Scaffold this active site. Structure first.
Site, PDB file in Angstrom:
ATOM      1  N   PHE A  49      44.383  44.890  51.194  1.00 28.66           N
ATOM      2  CA  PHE A  49      43.810  45.498  50.000  1.00 28.66           C
ATOM      3  C   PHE A  49      43.128  44.429  49.157  1.00 28.66           C
ATOM      4  O   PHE A  49      42.249  44.719  48.348  1.00 28.66           O
ATOM      5  CB  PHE A  49      44.881  46.231  49.179  1.00 28.66           C
ATOM      6  CG  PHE A  49      46.034  45.357  48.751  1.00 28.66           C
ATOM      7  CD1 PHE A  49      45.934  44.543  47.632  1.00 28.66           C
ATOM      8  CD2 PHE A  49      47.223  45.367  49.460  1.00 28.66           C
ATOM      9  CE1 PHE A  49      46.992  43.744  47.240  1.00 28.66           C
ATOM     10  CE2 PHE A  49      48.288  44.573  49.071  1.00 28.66           C
ATOM     11  CZ  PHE A  49      48.172  43.761  47.958  1.00 28.66           C
ATOM     12  N   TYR A  56      43.395  31.541  43.341  1.00 29.19           N
ATOM     13  CA  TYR A  56      44.520  31.043  44.131  1.00 29.19           C
ATOM     14  C   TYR A  56      45.418  30.128  43.300  1.00 29.19           C
ATOM     15  O   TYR A  56      44.954  29.133  42.732  1.00 29.19           O
ATOM     16  CB  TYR A  56      44.008  30.303  45.368  1.00 29.19           C
ATOM     17  CG  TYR A  56      45.112  29.751  46.249  1.00 29.19           C
ATOM     18  CD1 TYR A  56      45.643  28.484  46.030  1.00 29.19           C
ATOM     19  CD2 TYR A  56      45.625  30.501  47.299  1.00 29.19           C
ATOM     20  CE1 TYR A  56      46.655  27.984  46.828  1.00 29.19           C
ATOM     21  CE2 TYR A  56      46.636  30.008  48.105  1.00 29.19           C
ATOM     22  CZ  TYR A  56      47.147  28.750  47.865  1.00 29.19           C
ATOM     23  OH  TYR A  56      48.153  28.256  48.666  1.00 29.19           O
TER      24      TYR A  56
END
Lengths: 405, 405, 404, 407, 406
Positions: free
Chosen positions: B405, B122
């Site tokens: 996904f 992240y």
């Protein structure tokens, strides 16, 4: 029972008037707030129905000034205290009060009225449209480190008394709000209400506290209002944080987040684009719950559209329908940009068809006209008009909720 | 002893995916692994292997994403980013991403996209959050629409997956040119999106499909949802609702909201400007929680900026700094509008200084460049540039999260 | 900023107001007033910026029971705060050096500090030496083992004034065998029995029970508060003590058989509270253990010679004091049940440890062997740690005194 | 050294009440103690005093209760039953109740009544649960009425306590002859019932009063309720204390007023009748949760007079062999002949039909507990075939008994 | 195009039941669908089919119910009332019920009964709630009995389903003549009631069976329950049914469940609101009692239904009955009934009480007082004193109770 529509006559009448409004909302009268809010209350703007012995319906307005997209500060009716007794529902009292109020608002030169969505009794009626949202931000302070490239500056912080806070905070507020559409001017009297150590909020958390941020030269450049909630997991309930530059803003938040015995922080009523959201390195640690804030009722459509500025050039003809006040219905040509704006009646072909409620919703740049059209609430009459007008009615800075009224 | 390599065969694929689930504390989902193989390219699935097991992974799907303006460009859909707990903080994640971004650059793909739920990387490597999603929920009994909402003459049928897949692709292909962030869906991707996965059956129930038909029989809307029977608290978990016109969209939602024995509805992964939010008459009845969705990594900055369109005319010079891939650093002149876009190296004076991460954040029109500047993350070098560029980088329709996904 | 002590009464209330403010609380006026009576202004230090207090650190002159029954003077450290705008600037460290130096000059060999003083937890050589247990459960599930003798005693619910005429003598009689407890003057009893507004909101008004022997002699007492139902009525026990097993068990049985009670809670009990072993079904009485008292040894040789030891010990301790290096040195400890001595020696050291870890084992509430197995204490010669750990222990676990 | 005696003076009264609240883990409610003094007879408030404090209490109010058939008879409203925790299980409760029941019979009261919340003597001394109450609650948005329910042309006003007390007593007096279990309310009892007690303000809010007026101006219904403002999502509640009306339209319209009130999420009525008409006005019963629990216990002290004072749902001629363990002077064989318009009871030498205790007899006395169910449970014994079935029907009543105002 | 028809074959049956479960947001319970087929009559299972799937359903079982007074009469046990969410508010439910009620009347069934959990048609078509059920629950440690309760000399055994099914029917058959609302249980209905359904296994555990024996060996009581092991300690027992032929066997069987080791809480959903357990317990507040709807009654042959039951006392009343859904039943009926007699016929005498067929059905089983309905404004008294006399007669000393689920 014979009802009389009248304004507040004296001070005992005022306290009885405010007592009835709290009673409709299932609450006892907050005496401290009633007293401090009296100082900016105009009795002849506080209307209602009286049955001879008690107030059975109310609707008030404060004379305020609101920042528009582009920085212009225009007069606005801050509508408040909208109640009807549960024994007098569905009898026309709300409609009559609102007709009288909107007529008085228009005669005072106020081009629009603003109303907090928490005034649930008239949510979405009479042409009011939700135009501004607010965000509730919360999270564990240990998880809310900033991105490393955020400059905190050389500033210093001091916790100060209300008197000291009120000597520096007004100048800071006055300097930042031209870029924060939706914010309202704060006189000394409005600061007194905004900074009141209200009994209601003490019970929810604790006594109000004030912080000032100083530049290295001593200049006050930021402030914070917050209340502690000691453990019973100690929490901080932030009321407001502002700064005249990014360093003071970030440094003030870093101060609140680094407080030792605190676990959780909450900021109710922040902007949906509060800079704090983008200072935090890990967004998932800062919960963001978005809800309605301010409803807009356009009362003088051409002047209101000509008084704000627009994010890009726009030349569009709007067929505006006003169901509650059909005298405002008409076809208007809007010519606007960053530095100019005009709006006038036209007989040319209309490009967009919409209601005054939906027009009010997009007026502050917080709701996209394109989305209202995709939803079926607004109708495009000529190709490409809605997309261009939506961009122009938008703004790079989202509107934000003013101090409560 | 670690080897950087791609997946070699089918047993290698299953071991690779098993390790990715294992890093996330999960058993391997055999049904998802099986259906996703059909669009998996083994030579795009890289990782570290110690001779006996996979210790790190990072994969990418070849997909195509809608940009602001409707252009559909190839994009690397990054996936399966894991590192073994015994090999963390040793450079494996960084190495895999350098190779991956280089391969993406070598394939001519101008950008990569990555779900924020890939928590292990992240905010690293130049990825910036560019798209948000909203979780919408509330009691269905409280979610009546505004009265001016036209539901049309449409009809609805609950259908099998096979029947759904005969109509849903054509509806989807027609609406997504106006929904930036959405990705093309081949038959193989539809198979994964419509899979009745065991994991989601346990959270609620078996997947169900709805089709909306116009009066002439034309399919014009669809819904994917799962029921969660009471444990009086039956819930509907909506996965997706789309329609080619406002009437079919509203009618399909009204179908879900009027379903008998339903108490609560939840839509995770909706757009922050989901049309449902504005159809509902009483906004407070529909809770809206906003969170990160898609991160963008710009790999070919000039081509990426020239591929999208802009909400208004813009002529700005961007001094772009790319710390992870310094070969992308440079000074670029962006000239764009609604119908044109170009971006080129220039020696003129720079107007705005920013990182490639922050440039990616504003790239889809979901994050205001002005707010990043007010936060201190972006620097304005010449007056007025950020405001004009922020408006142009925005878009009247907010970007939204694609299929997972 | 000025480092100084409290000057007068207006200075005192402003000083105490700042301490509560750092802990996000309004000043408890009733507690502030009653605690003044045993406050020495020259032991209350802090930093003042010219108009308000920005840091505090205080100490009460108390006396604590050691393993073996000896009662020694101890600094009861309190009110450790620093303003949030002045954090991480050395103020807490500076105050602690001055306080520990004053403690040493006043002849106090050690300091004690409740772990709830979170702002300086685990710093400056303070080591957790005593634990407390929160005991709770449904009163209907807390029958005693049948061999529990309740005696012929009687009980009366009585006023605070009557309570204070008998409870000090009962307390003074039981604490020689309860290490960690502190002497209670009338002023400390006044604070311990205060009907504080804070605790009234958590439950209710304070109530007092006395247990009398058959001859009329008071032999036990209880302090508790009722929390009426909001069925879920609770009793919040503050303290129960008795001079014999029958009065202790009978007093607890009184609380447990009360008619309208559902649940009982005893926060701050001993981890070896006898109640735990009277109850027939242990799983019905939950036991949550946490830190209680931290010990800071200030004159190491004097401290080890004041306590007694559960078994004979002859060990050489290489003590390192990072915060106060003047106490660092190699000490030979010879102790037992009836004797104890400690002095600097040049003999080979057996055990290497810090003054913090030494303070943790000092009250017999933390095993020296466990600290060694964790890697915090290092054995230099074989078998030394085991012999010293047993000797530093005590058959009665230390317990938390009244709050300060 | 304990003394059994009555309350002597006003300081003694406050100490007596203070000890009772203390036993129940509560501080003394000064406002309730003050208003309840107005109908307290000191010589009916007995207890044990050890010379310095009260260690046990048991009191009784002189009240009047509606029986099946409409008769209003004197009844002892037993209250303030406490024992200090240091004096429990020493016979103090038993002694006080023996003295109280003897005093009750001499005052002409044929029975005593006692709220089940007086937990210290639940099910003892011949007290039997005879009346139940229902807690009704639900989301107000889900409580629409059946469409055939006529609300009438009435109007409503939220009014002060003083104005409420000018109309509510007449409405109450008119409906309670058809609501067995209700008690007469003097001005003093209305003052306690309508007290804005500090205790209940903290649980919700300040008490509020509603009056329903017919089209001609006649007051025909009232409501007493408290708001509980919202404190996650919104959740404001209404806590209903009482709703009554002299006709179905005023009753239904008054409830419709409370249910349609703006900003309300949930409504609660604790202490309603298990056959509260609201339960059957609501179109969707599952939206209104109904929790049934004990309300009033009955202690028969004059058995023959009590059976002769009430009326019976159908004709009955049955011989009851009654056993009274606590007061054996009430034991005997009684022939009961009663109906809708007649009732008599006397000792007889005929063969007995039913054998039961005075406790079980008290349980069925108000028509809220079926005598047949007590027999199927094994608590009551049938001596001749068909006797229990006929006696159970006659002891029943078409209107279930309901809880009176608290005492 | 939609077709109104009955089930044709077995694959049609499974598709039919699958659609019913789907409407109720559930996967099909294969085990329950299989065991309930054994007493399903395909020609009583009607619905709407659009050519490829079922879009609406409404079924009925041929059962027999005990009335107040002990008479066992045929009754339509209505079940599986569903309409697809895409076909709501188009008349499908109304059409199915018109056809169903017409068939019920022609089969000689004087009434239909329907569990309130069939939420899609709650309170419609003249169905009135006539029976309630109570959920009883509490901590077993707090549920001692009153001391005068005789438990007897009986013994208890946990037994298999086969052993249970050899004794439970005779016990059941002996007690239900005094329990209005209970229905006869054939072997096939016992098989469904005792099915170890996977749904209930997930909520708690495998079904278990208890038999109570008198001292002479005679089976005199039984219990059906499921354990829910602990997940603080908190193991629960979920009781499905407890019955006994005498007060001692009933109380002893409950005492067995309440004294079971390692149990904390017990729950009995679907008990009678006058379940004997409530009055055995010494401390009523320890046993929570939540009352809710159970069975709705739809009278289709008013005179025969009124004449088939018995009444707690003598009654002579004229009822002006309005039937909105089936107006052919509307009329003025004179009811003369008592403990040993009952007759009902259309009359032209002056009416005493005016009420709908729905409210008439509500009071029919003695679980709802006509007086309360009158005080509520739903029933109208036309002549003084009529409602009070009629309410008592329509009552019964034993409250009606919910039968086994259908």
């Amino acid at each position: 029972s014979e009802l009389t529509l009248r304004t507040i006559a004296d001070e005992d009448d005022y306290e009885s008037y405010m007592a009835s409004a709290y009673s409709v909302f299932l609450r006892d009268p907050q005496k401290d707030e009633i007293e401090v809010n009296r100082k900016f209350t105009e009795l002849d703007r506080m209307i209602g129905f009286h049955d001879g012995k008690k107030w059975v319906a109310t609707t008030g307005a404060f004379s305020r000034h609101v920042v528009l997209p582009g920085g212009a500060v225009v007069p606005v009716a801050a509508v408040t205290a909208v109640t009807v007794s549960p024994t007098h529902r569905r009898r026309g009292l709300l409609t009559t009060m609102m007709r009288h109020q909107l007529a008085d608002i228009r005669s005072r030169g106020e081009s629009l009225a603003m109303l907090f969505a928490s005034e649930a009794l008239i949510y979405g009626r009479f042409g009011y449209g939700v135009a501004t949202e607010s965000a509730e931000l919360s999270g564990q302070v240990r998880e809310l480190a900033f991105r490393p490239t955020v400059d905190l500056g050389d500033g210093t912080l001091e916790e100060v008394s209300a008197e000291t806070f009120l000597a520096s905070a007004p100048a800071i507020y006055d300097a930042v709000i031209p870029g924060l559409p939706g914010q309202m001017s704060r006189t000394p009297e409005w600061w007194a209400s905004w900074t009141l150590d209200s009994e209601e909020l003490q019970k929810e958390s604790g006594k109000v506290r004030f912080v000032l941020h100083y530049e290295s030269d001593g200049t006050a450049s930021g402030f914070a209002i917050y209340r502690p909630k000691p453990g019973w997991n100690a929490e901080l309930h932030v009321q407001e944080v502002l700064g005249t530059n990014p360093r003071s803003y970030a440094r003030t938040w870093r101060y609140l987040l680094d407080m030792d015995l605190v676990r959780k922080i909450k900021y109710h009523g922040a902007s949906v684009q509060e800079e704090l959201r983008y200072l935090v390195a890990n967004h998932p640690s800062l919960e963001c719950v978005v809800s309605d804030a301010i409803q807009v009722r356009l009362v003088d459509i051409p002047r209101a559209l000509a008084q704000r500025r627009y994010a890009a050039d726009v030349d569009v003809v709007l067929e505006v329908t006003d169901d509650f006040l059909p005298e405002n219905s008409g076809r208007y040509r809007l010519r606007g940009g960053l530095d100019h704006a005009s709006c006038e009646i036209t007989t040319d072909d209309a490009d967009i068809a919409l209601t005054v409620r939906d027009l009010g919703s997009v007026y502050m740049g917080g709701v996209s006209l394109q989305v209202l059209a995709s939803a079926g609430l607004v109708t495009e009459l000529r190709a490409g008009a809605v997309q261009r007008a939506a961009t122009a009615f938008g703004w790079p800075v989202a509107p934000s909720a003013p101090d409560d009224f």
